[PDB]
């Protein structure tokens, strides 16, 4: 909720070319949002669960 | 502390819609 407020303020507000950079989302979301989070949950199962 | 149900449920049942509807009715009818 603070992050959405922060990214509406004028020098923290992202430009248009940041949104249409599609090759950089696919590298970060596949490796980080999909891959690291699957790696982190495997760390949660082995250490804890 | 199960007595908080006696003070949150009537506020959300009564006070929350009365405060919301009386705000929105005066906001949609505002020149």
């Amino acid at each position: 909720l603070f992050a959405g407020w922060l990214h509406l303020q004028p020098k923290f507000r992202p430009s248009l070319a940041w949104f249409k950079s599609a090759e950089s989302r696919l590298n970060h979301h596949l490796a980080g949002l999909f891959g690291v989070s699957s790696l982190a949950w495997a760390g949660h199962l082995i250490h804890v669960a | 502390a199960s007595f908080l149900s006696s003070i949150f449920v009537p506020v959300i049942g009564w006070v929350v819609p009365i405060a919301t509807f009386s705000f929105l009715f005066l906001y949609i009818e505002r020149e």
Binding site: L1, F2, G4, W5, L8 | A1, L4
Partner: peptide
């Protein structure tokens, strides 16, 4: 269950997103 004290900590901590939700929903315009 949890103690009677811990319920009040959860209510006071819940004012922190309750304040920030009011800031975001009004920064998104009227």
């Amino acid at each position: 269950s949890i103690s009677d004290t811990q319920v009040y900590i959860a209510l006071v901590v819940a004012l922190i997103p309750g304040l920030l939700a009011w800031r975001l929903a009004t920064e998104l315009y009227k």
